[PDB]
Each structure stands twice: as structure tokens, then as C-alpha cells.
């Protein structure tokens, strides 16, 4: 269950601009993504919100190479 | 009790029950066998060997005189019989005789069905390219 670059890049692009809005909770991130990035598919929104949350655990623990917010 | 009976000059087996021992007659099958048991009023479950020759002379009479023993006409192996008479009367070794002469009647006038009997081919018009391949 790896993630394509269309959702890894999309997840990255949201975090650099919109870090404080996002949090460790997955269910809140679903609600934000529907408003802060116009995605026409529910399944695609969840996958990005799935990875965006997953990036927070690494980001909270420290810096990460790809994302610079 | 006998393991070997005789009726209408045909040997049966005494181990079988009365309806399934009367199939040994060439003209009698399974539906016909049960009927003559009911007409003769004998117990089906009782075996053929136990059954006394007092009933034999009636069963053979019934087999040869079914029309007057209240048997439906649509139960008869020979309906609208030619050569006079309109009744089966075929419960005997007479099954082969009528069958043998019917082909010869067809064969005499060179009827196509009769011709297919001469060559020993499929008679009722079926594909013979792949089936019925007994080597000759």
C-alpha cells in the first residue's frame, strides 16, 4: 500500500503552506482538505489526509528532508 | 419355492419379486408387469417363486387376453395391428416375429427406411459422421 507521487507531492504541498491548520488527528484533516484543496473525489481526499497525518508524526518528532515549512 | 419358473414358454427367476420377475417375458416390461399383478390381484411384495401355479394359468391368460381384462388400449405394444386384429398379443416370443416381418414388409417395396435396414445404417435419420463407429 505505497502512495503515488500525485498524493505524496499533494500532501507535501499542503503542509509547507498550511502547517498550523493541520493536526495529528486524521478526522480533522479530512475536513480541512475538502476546504483547503479542491479535490473532487472523496477517496483521493482521504489518501492525502492519510499521508498528511502520517507526515505530522515525523514532522513533530523533528525536521524532514522533503518538506520545509 | 423354486428358483426357476416357466410361463408362456419363457424361463424366469424365482428370487425376484413378482413384478420384477415378469420382466423376463420378452413382451412384458415394468409398467405392464405391475398392471397384470393388479388385474390378477396378487401380492406384489411376495416373491415369484412362492407364487403357486394356480395363479400362473391366469397370468398367462391375462397376458394373452388383456383387452377383455379391462386394460386400456393405449397400454398395448401393438395398436391398430395389421394382418387383422387390433390388439397387442405380443407378450410372447412373438416380439421378434412381428418385428422381423415389419422390416421385410418395408424391404419388399424398397422403402427408404427399409433400405436403411438392409445396409445396417442408422434408421431414424441421425448424423453418422462421428457416432455409431463400430469398426468394419
Amino acid at each position: 500500500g505505497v502512495r503515488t507521487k500525485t498524493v505524496k507531492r499533494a500532501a507535501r504541498n499542503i503542509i509547507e503552506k498550511y502547517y498550523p491548520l493541520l493536526t495529528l488527528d486524521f478526522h480533522t484533516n479530512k475536513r480541512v482538505v475538502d476546504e483547503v484543496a479542491v479535490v473532487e473525489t472523496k477517496r483521493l481526499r482521504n489518501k492525502i489526509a492519510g499521508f498528511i497525518t502520517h507526515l505530522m508524526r515525523r514532522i513533530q518528532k523533528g525536521p524532514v528532508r522533503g518538506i520545509s515549512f | 419355492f423354486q428358483h426357476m419358473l416357466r410361463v408362456c414358454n419363457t424361463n424366469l427367476d424365482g428370487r425376484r419379486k413378482v413384478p420384477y420377475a415378469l420382466t423376463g417375458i420378452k413382451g412384458c416390461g415394468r409398467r405392464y408387469a405391475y398392471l397384470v399383478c393388479k388385474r390378477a390381484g396378487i401380492d406384489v411384495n411376495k416373491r415369484a417363486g412362492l407364487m403357486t401355479p394356480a395363479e400362473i394359468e391366469k397370468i398367462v391368460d391375462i397376458l394373452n387376453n388383456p383387452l377383455n381384462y379391462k386394460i386400456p388400449v393405449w397400454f398395448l405394444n401393438r395398436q391398430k395391428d395389421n394382418k387383422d386384429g387390433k390388439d397387442s398379443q405380443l407378450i410372447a416370443n412373438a416380439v421378434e416375429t412381428r418385428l422381423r416381418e415389419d422390416i421385410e414388409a418395408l424391404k419388399k417395396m424398397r422403402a427408404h427406411r427399409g433400405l436403411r435396414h438392409y445396409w445396417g445404417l442408422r434408421v431414424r435419420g441421425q448424423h453418422t459422421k462421428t457416432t455409431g463407429r463400430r469398426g468394419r
Binding site: - | 419355492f1 424365482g14 428370487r15 416373491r47 417363486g49 412362492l50
Partner: protein, 41 residues
């Protein structure tokens, strides 16, 4: 081949085997329990 005669753990199969009688008769002796098998002791 067997010719196990037709006139004259308990199962009609075994009481037809070494009694040398047909299994139809083996039902008669056990009578004098289900419509699929007759098991007696």
C-alpha cells in the same frame, strides 16, 4: 456371484454378510431405527 439366498453391533449389512442371506431378509429378522439406517444392539 454371491447368490445369498432370498427366502428362509447389529446392522442389516453385517447380518446379511455372515448369515448368507440377502439384506432384504435381514430387515425381517431385525423386525421380529431410521429410514436411512437400522442400527441395533
Amino acid at each position: 456371484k454371491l447368490n445369498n439366498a432370498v427366502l428362509f453391533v447389529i446392522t442389516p449389512a453385517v447380518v446379511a454378510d455372515r448369515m448368507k442371506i440377502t439384506c432384504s431378509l435381514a430387515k425381517i429378522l431385525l423386525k421380529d431405527v431410521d429410514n436411512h439406517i437400522w442400527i441395533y444392539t
